[PDB]
Design a protein around this ligand. Structure first.
Ligand code: TJY
Length: 160
């Protein structure tokens, strides 16, 4: 029976069958999640560019890296940003299904330097649930903060 879990650790050390990179539309290495991700799967960045609100899979050997591009809320209106964030997660669910994986390691898109300086834990996590609820995969959400870990865990436990 597929589950949602949260882990406070480096997504580059995930124990899942594939990883979602919080990517930029240029397909460039970047910093944060994208940094450790670039260092662990650099060959996954070959032709990894995909537009805001989309996801693109690049294989690193047989290990799929799903480059998902959340909106930078600095650049987007709240309404248009929300739509692009929902869309990015929809494309992640499609890739996860197409790959036939049993599990996926995923960050909360648009919650760091793309957040526009605002707390988007609930906004981002709800878009993640909406997309991934139609999939068969175990989902492991990776965060770095302790508080965020607690809140994500509570939101997971609240649905069951
Ligand atoms: O803020 C983020 O977590 C984030 N979400 C994303 O979808 N893409 C990003 C690309 C570069 C840096 C940060 C990000």
């Amino acid at each position: 029976a597929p589950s949602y879990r949260v882990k406070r650790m480096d997504i580059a050390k995930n124990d899942e069958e594939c990883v979602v990179n919080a990517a930029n539309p240029r397909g460039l290495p970047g910093d944060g999640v994208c940094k450790a991700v670039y260092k662990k799967w650099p060959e996954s960045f070959k032709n990894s560019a995909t537009p805001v609100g989309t996801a693109k899979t690049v294989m690193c050997g047989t290990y799929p890296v799903i480059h998902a591009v959340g909106p930078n809320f600095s650049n987007y209106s709240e309404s248009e940003g929300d739509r692009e964030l929902a869309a990015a997660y929809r494309e992640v669910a499609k890739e996860v299904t197409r790959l036939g994986v049993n599990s996926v390691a995923i960050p909360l898109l648009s919650t760091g330097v793309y957040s526009g300086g605002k707390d988007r834990l609930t906004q981002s996590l709800n878009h993640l649930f909406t997309a991934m609820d139609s999939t068969d995969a175990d989902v492991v959400i990776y965060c770095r903060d302790k508080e965020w870990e607690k809140k994500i865990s509570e939101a997971i436990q609240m649905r069951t």
